[PDB]
Amino acid sequence: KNQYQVEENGLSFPLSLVDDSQLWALASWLEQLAEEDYLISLTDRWLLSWEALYRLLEDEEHASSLPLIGVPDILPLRASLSSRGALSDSDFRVWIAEWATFPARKPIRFSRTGAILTHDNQQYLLSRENWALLQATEQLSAQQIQTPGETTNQLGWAAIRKCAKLAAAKFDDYLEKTHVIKPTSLSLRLRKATVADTAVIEIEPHFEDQPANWLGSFDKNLQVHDSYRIPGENGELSHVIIPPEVKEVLNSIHSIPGRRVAGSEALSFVRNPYTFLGEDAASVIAPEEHEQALFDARIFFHHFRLIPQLNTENKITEVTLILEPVSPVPQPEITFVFSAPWELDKFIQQLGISVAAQMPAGSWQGYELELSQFTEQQWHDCQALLTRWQQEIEAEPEIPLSLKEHIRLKDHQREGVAWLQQLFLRSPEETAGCLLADDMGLGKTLQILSFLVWFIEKFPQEPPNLIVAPVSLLDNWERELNNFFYTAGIPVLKLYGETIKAVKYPKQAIPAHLQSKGIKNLLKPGWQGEAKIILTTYETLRDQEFSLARQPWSIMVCDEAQKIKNPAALITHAANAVQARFKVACTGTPVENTLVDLWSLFDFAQPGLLGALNEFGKQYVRPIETERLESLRALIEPQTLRRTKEEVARDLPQKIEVESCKQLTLSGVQKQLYLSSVANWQQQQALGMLGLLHRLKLICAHPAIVNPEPRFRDNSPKLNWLLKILAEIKHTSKDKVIIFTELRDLQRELQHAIHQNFGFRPVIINGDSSTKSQSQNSRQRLIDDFQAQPGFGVIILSTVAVGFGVNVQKANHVIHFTRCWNPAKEDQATDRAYRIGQTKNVYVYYPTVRDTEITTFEETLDDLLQRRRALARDMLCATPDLNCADFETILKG
């Protein structure tokens, strides 16, 4: 018997399953899927659509839960496509002539309902590729009876051919010779060349399945066509249909003469095409792929320094030009020698052309010159140097007044606001920025907001302030600005969303002198309006870098500054291109992989503090990757404000880590199961480790999941401890409890045990709080209902579910039933209860099963996580997740 009713749109599950006590596991998993956007709520029934079905089958977090419903096995099938007529004919039609077994090639006939097959009293499943091919053919058939014609046939069979190539389907004679390609994304092939007097760069657009002769026709035509017809050398014909989003990129590539990049405008397009094109280009050209193409082609935009060499008579002998490479990997510098004024004159002419074009690209003898930070003062200094050479030859913080009277800054928050203000009062001359590296949950947002509002009230006539953060954090920034301050004298503009369109230039209204540079994306003058704080995203910063860098700012805030950890990233280049009086880098983890992250952050905040990247690498990266760390920490100390939750443990509730839970003991059945598992894994390896570690984690947490025998059901020490302490909490304080576990089956087991022993089912939440208001609002409503319920309560969250904009301050007890391999995730999950605004002591439970003769997986995990957290207390230390190599002690016994 199948638990689902098959329909044309997916598998359907009745809502009455929640009312069946014998099907508790299935009902709980259906609730989990509904919470995780896998199920659609219909009239008294859940819907598991075919796309959701395939995504679920590919999901590994629900792999153990799949046997609950029992989806039919995928039947290996290869389709054979037939057709009649040609694309020109309005009666053109493509249908799947037959299906055959992939190895056997035997024709098969089925009875099909949606994606579920029926061969002979046995239901099967269509492959995702075969289902997509069938969907494409049926969509072409449905579209032809509506709008028959050439375009419909071409688009429909382009989709069909893509699906059939993905599904390895066989075409007939005509469809094999016919080719219709509709590019969705574009690839830019960059290769340095020396066509001109100096080096140039060649751009070559590339499709996923570009025809062999498409580029020739693309070059020959004076305009980019919506459609291309390219004869093939094999007697075939190829059609290319260019969507408008791809067409704008192809227009920009085609406007470059000969597809050779020479000059400031073309090199600026190569540096960052998204400012010239817009946000639509990111969907056409992947920014990471563009960065990789720039790296592979050795296209680095160097920073240059002109060092005049002085003679004994204070006269210039020669000028040395040092080009500092920009890349994630430090590279040796490039040094030139100007022994005569005319060489420096040519260099100055190149710089003048690049700055008169108002472009950040530059060029000099086959090397690019990042001119984003090349201010007008540097240009005047270079001109003065050239002229000179030619002539010679020939603290109490200030709280904002608009802060609400019921809001009090903490002592550390007041210290941070005072530190920010004192650093800002010398921001033009002495400092240039700072790194606010406090841990999460210390109210860094409120400190920065207080600093910004104090600046706005104190100096109302200064340029506006820029906040760059992910949208999920931009919403939080606006929310907290409204919550903490009287937002009457602080106008705000949020560039993300349709507000970018409200201030964007019309496509044809861009000024002609800027359209000649290939600039298709621009913001209308006065786009700032009366706003004093402007909220924008890193992606919007990259896309509107040209418009954002055209006016001076006062304070630029980069929240989660680890987004600019890569020196060569386009987002990092956009962030450094923006000219602000003070730049605050805000991240709780300044170093994630290497100290180059810290170098990038401080080059953004205080340029030149750590020197060039090669010097930093040879001085602080290579020696480290210690006294080097203690010197780096004292060099960055004056402009770094690093505070941890242990330093500010008094402006917080009391976090009690219970020790009684960590002394649990393996039962005899659990111990023998673990020993048998380890022995079997070792025997298999003698005749990988991640599977053994997962099995040991499941054995220690709930041995019944590993083995459904009755012995393992009644011999789970961690479950017994959980039930006992939940009873104690219920009968003692009536507090709310958060149980953290990522395993769906373990979540269902814990929910069932809590329901049996306490009469209510804890709500399981595994999804995040991203922009998914169709279900994010439901998850927030569940959280609020749990918090608002009086008295005792239990909720089963997951570490990945918690995050931004989610908190449970009505719960005091945090239980990590299964522990993650990254202490930062555990800390962020515990910081859902342990927070500012938690009025009761926080009891953190780490139930650990230990053995007197065996070092269990949980004991080793606890020790490793303690060591990793102790290391992570250091700001300059990276925090990688644990791996199978870190657990290479269980094999010892």
In sequence order, what are the residues at sequence separation of 6 or more whose Cβ sits closer than 8 angstroms to the Cβ of residue 509? none
Shortest separation between residue 770's beta carbon and ligand AGS, angstroms: 15
CA atoms within 13 A on the CB side of 599: 24
Q: Which is nearer to ligand AGS, 444 or 655 (CB)?
A: 444
In sequence order, what are the residues at sequence separation of 6 or more whose Cβ sits closer than 8 angstroms to the Cβ of residue 52? 10, 37, 38, 39, 40
DSSP string, 112-140: -BTTEEESSS-EEE--HHHHHHHHHHHHH
Q: By C-alpha distance, which of 245, 256, 362 is closest to 299?
A: 362
Question: Is residue 408 a contact point for ligand AGS (CB under 6 A)?
Answer: yes
Contacting range for ligand AGS; rule: CB under 6 A; set: 620-628, 725-733, 755-763, 833-841 = 833-841
Q: Which is nearer to ligand AGS, 413 or 562 (CB)?
A: 413
Shortest separation between residue 794's beta carbon and ligand AGS, angstroms: 24
Q: What is the DSSP pairing of strand 736-740 with strand 849-850?
A: unpaired
Question: What CA–CA distance (Å, rounded) separates 583 from 467?
Answer: 10
Question: What CA–CA distance (Å, rounded) separates 833 from 793?
Answer: 14
Question: What CA–CA distance (Å, rounded) separates 771 from 472?
Answer: 8
Shortest separation between residue 762's beta carbon and ligand AGS, angstroms: 25
Tokens of 382: 């270079």
Q: Which is nearer to ligand AGS, 263 or 441 (CB)?
A: 441
Q: Which is nearer to ligand AGS, 438 or 826 (CB)?
A: 438
Shortest separation between residue 651's beta carbon and ligand AGS, angstroms: 9
Q: Which is nearer to ligand AGS, 154 or 589 (CB)?
A: 589
Q: Which is nearer to ligand AGS, 537 or 670 (CB)?
A: 537
Shortest separation between residue 507's beta carbon and ligand AGS, angstroms: 36
Shortest separation between residue 838's beta carbon and ligand AGS, angstroms: 10
Shortest separation between residue 600's beta carbon and ligand AGS, angstroms: 19
The Cβ of residue 223 has, within 10 Å, a number of other Cβ atoms equal to: 8
Q: Which is nearer to ligand AGS, 189 or 408 (CB)?
A: 408
Q: By C-alpha distance, which of 471, 466, 420, 410 is closest to 441?
A: 410
Q: What is the DSSP pairing of strand 533-536 with strand 492-494?
A: parallel
Shortest separation between residue 162's beta carbon and ligand AGS, angstroms: 41
Which residue in 837, 852, 885, 892 binds ligand AGS (CB under 6 A)?
837
Question: Is residue 531 a contact point for ligand AGS (CB under 6 A)?
Answer: no
Question: What CA–CA distance (Å, rounded) separates 675 from 654?
Answer: 39
Question: What CA–CA distance (Å, rounded) separates 23 from 765?
Answer: 20
Question: Is residue 827 a contact point for ligand AGS (CB under 6 A)?
Answer: no
What burial class does residue 322 get, using C-beta atoms within 10 Å of its C-beta: 0-12 exposed, 13-18 middle, 19+ buried?
Answer: middle
Site for ligand AGS in 539-568 (CB under 6 A): 559
Q: Which is nearer to ligand AGS, 588 or 847 (CB)?
A: 588
Site for ligand AGS in 409-428 (CB under 6 A): 409-410, 413
Question: Is residue 444 a contact point for ligand AGS (CB under 6 A)?
Answer: yes
Contacting range for ligand AGS; rule: CB under 6 A; set: 301-309, 319-327, 441-449, 488-496 = 441-449
Instruction: Compute the residue count for the chain.
Output: 893
Question: Is residue 649 a contact point for ligand AGS (CB under 6 A)?
Answer: no
* Total of residues contacting ligand AGS (CB under 6 A): 18
Contacting range for ligand AGS; rule: CB under 6 A; set: 60-68, 310-318, 378-386, 830-838 = 830-838
Buried b (16+ CB within 10 A) or exposed e, 546-577: bbbbeeebbbbbbbbbbbbbbbbbbbbbbbbb
Question: What CA–CA distance (Å, rounded) separates 715 from 703?
Answer: 8
Which residue in 246, 467, 586, 754 binds ligand AGS (CB under 6 A)?
586
The Cβ of residue 662 has, within 10 Å, a number of other Cβ atoms equal to: 16
Distance of CA 511 to the CA centre of its chain: 35
Question: Is residue 836 a contact point for ligand AGS (CB under 6 A)?
Answer: yes
DSSP string, 699-714: HHH-HHHH--SHHHHS
The Cβ of residue 342 has, within 10 Å, a number of other Cβ atoms equal to: 10
Contacting range for ligand AGS; rule: CB under 6 A; set: 123-131, 164-172, 407-415, 811-819 = 407-415
Contacting range for ligand AGS; rule: CB under 6 A; set: 9-17, 235-243, 371-379, 408-416 = 408-416
Q: Which is nearer to ligand AGS, 205 or 443 (CB)?
A: 443
Q: By C-alpha distance, which of 717, 701, 725, 738 is closest to 858?
A: 701
Amino acid at 803: G
Q: Which is nearer to ligand AGS, 746 or 833 (CB)?
A: 833
Residue nearest to ligand AGS (CB): 443
Shortest separation between residue 836's beta carbon and ligand AGS, angstroms: 4
CA distance to 435, 497, 615, per residue, from 631 (Å): 17, 44, 14
Question: What CA–CA distance (Å, rounded) separates 708 from 164?
Answer: 43
Q: Which is nearer to ligand AGS, 286 or 836 (CB)?
A: 836
Amino acid at 500: I
Which residue in 10, 263, 325, 443 binds ligand AGS (CB under 6 A)?
443
Question: Is residue 446 a contact point for ligand AGS (CB under 6 A)?
Answer: yes
Shortest separation between residue 445's beta carbon and ligand AGS, angstroms: 4
Question: What CA–CA distance (Å, rounded) separates 22 from 28?
Answer: 12
Q: Which phi and psi angles does 437 have, rounded to 5°?
A: -110, 30
Which residue in 281, 442, 510, 648 binds ligand AGS (CB under 6 A)?
442
Q: Are 94 and 157 in contact (CB under 8 A)?
A: yes
Which residue in 354, 372, 445, 822 binds ligand AGS (CB under 6 A)?
445
Q: Which is nearer to ligand AGS, 275 or 413 (CB)?
A: 413
Tokens of 477: 């920034």
Q: Which is nearer to ligand AGS, 416 or 464 (CB)?
A: 416
Q: Which is nearer to ligand AGS, 272 or 640 (CB)?
A: 640
Shortest separation between residue 408's beta carbon and ligand AGS, angstroms: 6
Shortest separation between residue 831's beta carbon and ligand AGS, angstroms: 8
The Cβ of residue 45 has, within 10 Å, a number of other Cβ atoms equal to: 17
Contacting range for ligand AGS; rule: CB under 6 A; set: 49-57, 87-95, 282-290, 401-409 = 401-409
Q: Which runs of E-coded beta strand occur in 446-526?
A: 465-468, 492-494
CA distance to 4, 65, 272, 521, 861, per residue, from 506 (Å): 52, 52, 21, 9, 58
Q: By C-alpha distance, which of 582, 601, 605 is closest to 592?
A: 601
Shortest separation between residue 476's beta carbon and ligand AGS, angstroms: 6
Q: Which is nearer to ligand AGS, 272 or 413 (CB)?
A: 413
Which residue in 835, 840, 850, 869 binds ligand AGS (CB under 6 A)?
835
Q: Which is nearer to ligand AGS, 94 or 591 (CB)?
A: 591
Shortest separation between residue 443's beta carbon and ligand AGS, angstroms: 3
Shortest separation between residue 768's beta carbon and ligand AGS, angstroms: 15
Shortest separation between residue 483's beta carbon and ligand AGS, angstroms: 7
Shortest separation between residue 660's beta carbon and ligand AGS, angstroms: 29
Q: Which is nearer to ligand AGS, 270 or 557 (CB)?
A: 557
Q: Which is nearer to ligand AGS, 440 or 877 (CB)?
A: 440
Contacting range for ligand AGS; rule: CB under 6 A; set: 36-44, 131-139, 226-234, 832-840 = 832-840
For ligand AGS, the binding residues (CB under 6 A) are 407-410, 413, 438, 440-446, 559, 586, 835-837
